[PDB]
A and B are shown apart, each in its own frame.
Chain A
């Protein structure tokens, strides 16, 4: 039972994923941390999608290193909270979506805070934070998403547990089963087998690029920056050696020139990954189309959008 103001607004998308899946989306609230380059993209097309509420969380303050990298921040908001400075712009995208803002960092949140969210999306978080939140979400049947952007590259991960959706072909209406796995099992894969070695050749190198960058964000509290390229590459050029061998893989499986195409937040790479990641959130809350299982790696140079399944 939607009003007439919502029927004309969402008219073009009700003709795409139906009315019932829109009503399932109207009653959903999403938790999004990492309001930044990728987070602003996800928040935009989620408030336009027609959720009930969206809680934007970010402890870091507006650093003067993203002047136009985020469009939810008006000029001269340095020193203010990144989520607060993004409130007024994100609220105007849809007055029917109460956009809430949180200031405390995601690490110091109790388990009971996430229960009010039907879905959680992480951005710009260390590995330990991603595993911590996915384990909490999987405990309470909460849909978990995460993603980041590095230069021309990007990734999205999804964990929905036992997720049943409804597809159709002929008109019709078909239910299917798709089981996801926690992110901790997807990041640490046993690459020693007849199946593991044979399936490694078909796996994109952006996954190991994701391992090298997550390890970098773990060793140091920030991703590589363009100003520190002079020897942030040499640390990256050694993490690729000290990580790929820890998994028993050849070192030059990931190309060496990767330290030139994964070094900043590029707005086109945010829109591509943010559009794909937010679409996986919409089809999950509506339980309609089959979601991507379980990774999606983007390469803005070659134009590749590869969907990997590296859980088991």
Chain B
């Protein structure tokens, strides 16, 4: 604290720093920051404390289960060092109130989130503000730390991070071969009944399958009765799968179930078929109480930690798993696949957080030349290095974010894709823009999407071909919140597949 080079210790005690997220690395980072000398710290996180979090996030206890991770963290740190100017934000970093002017307050920004969408945003905010970003991530025994500064190093999106698997609807509900396909179907099933009605998440058998030739309105008209929804979802929808004989020539598709047939005949233990049908009935009744408190058609956001929500997905995925002759898996085994649970321990977070402040001290010393990317392995490599350091790479000249004039090329069907698909699934989802502004390169500035509310809602249903968009049409996408401008080249293609709406050349 006091024992540091005097110019370095002055920059720490006066400089302002930002922590994005109070998760695993978040708690260890606040500690190492305060015990080093950092007194001006801003912490922002939206999640709340869960009983599963207090094994590695020591700033929280069983007393604080339910409260926000940001408010409790500010209270817990003011105990061992009350003279700490810490500002706690119980908000999302994606909120437009945290503009480039807000990010430019800090001399250092450090990431502590797990999802790429928010990390892509914080990456683009720290570039626009030209404030160094220390990106960090943990996974079991492994962890990584790197430094991002505009014009010096490559940004978070200079290289494509590994994307998860996405299975098409024709494979999810018509030919589910892996146990994961039943879990996605159960997560689909929970969304149709007690969640927001999604289009691509249909659980009913698909009739337009290439290998071939409302559910919620019925769910709400049935009264959410467990006995009735069982027979319709597990036998009738399977019998309409038997209507289509073309798929079943290759593999076996038995067998439909029956509530009166199977019910009469430590989460790590795989139960029988008679038990999962009972938890399916129990889940509907418990989720009907969680839905009765809500009003005006309010939905229920699925949570992996929610017992009633977990009991439904586990029982529904296992019953369908037994339906399609697949060997059923356990509840403890499926909770890791349902909610994408990343196993994390306190030691891995502590080691990574210590490396963050060490890299931060080199940034505040002007020693950005000495900054390194550090890998925490599980066993020593042939160089006997458990912590492997390496130099930072220069910015990628072909990145679509931090380059001079980024310019992507999208291949899609112009007469099929709507403008709403362009806004949500293309510009905001794939390209991770928060509040986008898209116009057509044609001299007049044909406005497709506007940042302000509903200025372009009359265009969402319209197809892209209704605006003269053709093969080679150039769209200028702007996210002034991120101070980011992207040019989208349009290529017209009709040979993509009925489950593929677009694709990027790369």
Stretch at the interface among A69-77, A99-107, A178-186: A69-77
Contact with A along B386-410 (1 / 0, CB 8 A): 1111000000000000000000000
In-complex Cβ contact of A276 among B3, B344, B358, B386 (8 A): B386
Number of interchain pairs (Cβ within 8 Å): 166
How far apart sit A122 and B344, CA to CA, in the bound complex (Å)? Answer: 26
Contact B353 A44 (CB under 8 A): no
Contact with B along A206-232 (1 / 0, CB 8 A): 000000000000000000001000000
Main secondary structure of the interface of B (DSSP, over half): mixed
Minimum CB–CB distance from B95 to chain A (whole Å) comes to: 28
Contact A302 B372 (CB under 8 A): yes
Within 8 A of A (CB), among B298-325: none
Interface size on A, as a range, is 35 or more
Contact A10 B55 (CB under 8 A): yes
Q: A49-B346, A304-B385 are in contact. Are A264 and B3 (CB under 8 A)?
A: yes
How far apart sit A235 and B190, CA to CA, in the bound complex (Å)? Answer: 71
Contact with B along A251-289 (1 / 0, CB 8 A): 000000000000110111111101110110010000001
In-complex Cβ contact of B389 among A152, A269, A304, A307 (8 A): A304
Q: Is B222 an interface residue (CB 8 A)?
A: no
**Chain A residues whose CB sits within 8 angstroms of the CB of B353 once the complex forms:** 268, 271
Residue of B nearest to A48 (CB): B346
Q: A12-B343, A13-B345, A71-B31 are in contact. Are A275 and B52 (CB under 8 A)?
A: no
Q: Is A68 an interface residue (CB 8 A)?
A: yes
Contact A303 B343 (CB under 8 A): no
Contact B80 A68 (CB under 8 A): yes
Contact A263 B3 (CB under 8 A): yes
**Chain B residues whose CB sits within 8 angstroms of the CB of A296 once the complex forms:** 386
How far apart sit A284 and B504, CA to CA, in the bound complex (Å)? Answer: 49
Contact with B along A130-142 (1 / 0, CB 8 A): 0000000000000
**Chain A residues whose CB sits within 8 angstroms of the CB of B432 once the complex forms:** none
**Chain B residues whose CB sits within 8 angstroms of the CB of A241 once the complex forms:** none
Which interface residue of A9, A19, A45 has the most chain B CB atoms within 10 A?
A45
Q: Is B357 an interface residue (CB 8 A)?
A: yes
Contact A307 B354 (CB under 8 A): no
Contact B347 A268 (CB under 8 A): no
Q: Is A148 an interface residue (CB 8 A)?
A: no
**Chain A residues whose CB sits within 8 angstroms of the CB of B378 once the complex forms:** 289
Q: Is B459 an interface residue (CB 8 A)?
A: no
**Chain B residues whose CB sits within 8 angstroms of the CB of A301 once the complex forms:** 370
Minimum CB–CB distance from B328 to chain A (whole Å) comes to: 20
How far apart sit A95 and B36, CA to CA, in the bound complex (Å)? Answer: 28
Contact A9 B81 (CB under 8 A): no
Q: Is B54 an interface residue (CB 8 A)?
A: yes
Q: Is A8 an interface residue (CB 8 A)?
A: yes
Minimum CB–CB distance from A87 to chain B (whole Å) comes to: 14
Minimum CB–CB distance from B333 to chain A (whole Å) comes to: 10
**10 A-B pairs whose Cβ atoms sit less than 8 Å apart in the complex:** A13-B345, A45-B350, A49-B346, A74-B79, A266-B36, A267-B1, A267-B354, A275-B348, A292-B386, A304-B387
